[PDB]
Amino acid sequence: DFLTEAHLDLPMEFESIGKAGSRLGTALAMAVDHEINMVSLVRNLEEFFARESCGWCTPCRDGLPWSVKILRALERGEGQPGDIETLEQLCRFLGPGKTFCAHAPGAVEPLQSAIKYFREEFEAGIKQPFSNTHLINGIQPNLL
Amino acid sequence: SIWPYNFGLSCCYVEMVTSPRQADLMVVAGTCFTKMAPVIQRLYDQMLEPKWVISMGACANSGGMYDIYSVVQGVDKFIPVDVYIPGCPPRPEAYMQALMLLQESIGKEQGVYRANMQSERERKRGERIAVTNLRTPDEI
Numbered sequence A: 001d002f003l004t005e006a007h008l009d010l011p012m013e014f015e016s017i018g019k020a021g022s023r024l025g026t027a028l029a030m031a032v033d034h035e036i037n038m039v040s041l042v043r044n045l046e047e048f049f050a051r052e053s054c055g056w057c058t059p060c061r062d063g064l065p066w067s068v069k070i071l072r073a074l075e076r077g078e079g080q081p082g083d084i085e086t087l088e089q090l091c092r093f094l095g096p097g098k099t100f101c102a103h104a105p106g107a108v109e110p111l112q113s114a115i116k117y118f119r120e121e122f123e124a125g126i127k128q129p130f131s132n133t134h135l136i137n138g139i140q141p142n143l144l
Numbered sequence B: 001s002i003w004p005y006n007f008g009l010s011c012c013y014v015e016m017v018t019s020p021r022q023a024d025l026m027v028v029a030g031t032c033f034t035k036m037a038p039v040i041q042r043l044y045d046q047m048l049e050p051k052w053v054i055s056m057g058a059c060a061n062s063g064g065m066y067d068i069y070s071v072v073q074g075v076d077k078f079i080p081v082d083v084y085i086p087g088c089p090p091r092p093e094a095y096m097q098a099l100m101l102l103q104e105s106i107g108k109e110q111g112v113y114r115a116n117m118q119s120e121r122e123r124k125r126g127e128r129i130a131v132t133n134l135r136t137p138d139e140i
């Protein structure tokens, strides 16, 4: 999970990074500066995680490509208003014990932290309304 | 000059309204029941020698939707029928087209005459099959 400048001055132990909302991992840290768009950074991360799925279990094999396609829409500015709430649901349902191994829980850990700390750049992607259906002549639709 | 005895009963005689020993036509409408079938068989017997019978509606042509223990599957099982008018209920215009289809039989005589072999399924076929466009149903 991503951490902020406020999360420095904090020791590099397993339970100290654990109480800060993240995991200590390999202990090799990566710095993100002010010129990297967070949505593009997460989209690069999820693209790696989606394509490195072994394909055994459904919420990794099929859940993660949906997250990638939403982030590509957010990065280009084609995001729809239900998209961010889908990313939240994906993170909840790809947690520990719901998938077959720990690959998928590790994949959603950057995604859920970046929405929590940087929601404004994710909200900036939403510039188009919701439409996943096309009109059919002679059939009046069900108007919500 | 055709005298009609209408035995329409329920939900098929309401269209007819919108549209003994004296009649030559018996327009059976409505559902024919096992219990009331002798009544229609005696009324058919009472009439004179040149009888004509028009069945209108699915409940009189066949059993219709009532393929059930208490309904006979068509009035043609026990009385001869001349014209069949599908629908549930048929239209008054259909009743008019039945009398027009029946005067042709009254003027064509064993009244088949090798001319009644032509059927409205084959006669209006080139009319119906050449239809391409129909009005969209989202409008009145």
Ligand code: SF4
Residues within 6 Å of the ligand: A052, A053, A054, A055, A056, A057, A058, A060, A061, A099, A100, A101, A102, A103, A104
């Ligand atoms: S979560 Fe693990 S087991 Fe399931 S598809 Fe992904 S890599 Fe394979």
Ligand code: SF4
Residues within 6 Å of the ligand: B010, B011, B012, B029, B030, B031, B056, B057, B058, B059, B060, B064, B087, B088, B089, B090
């Ligand atoms: S044919 Fe249809 S409308 Fe006529 S009596 Fe039977 S159910 Fe009613």
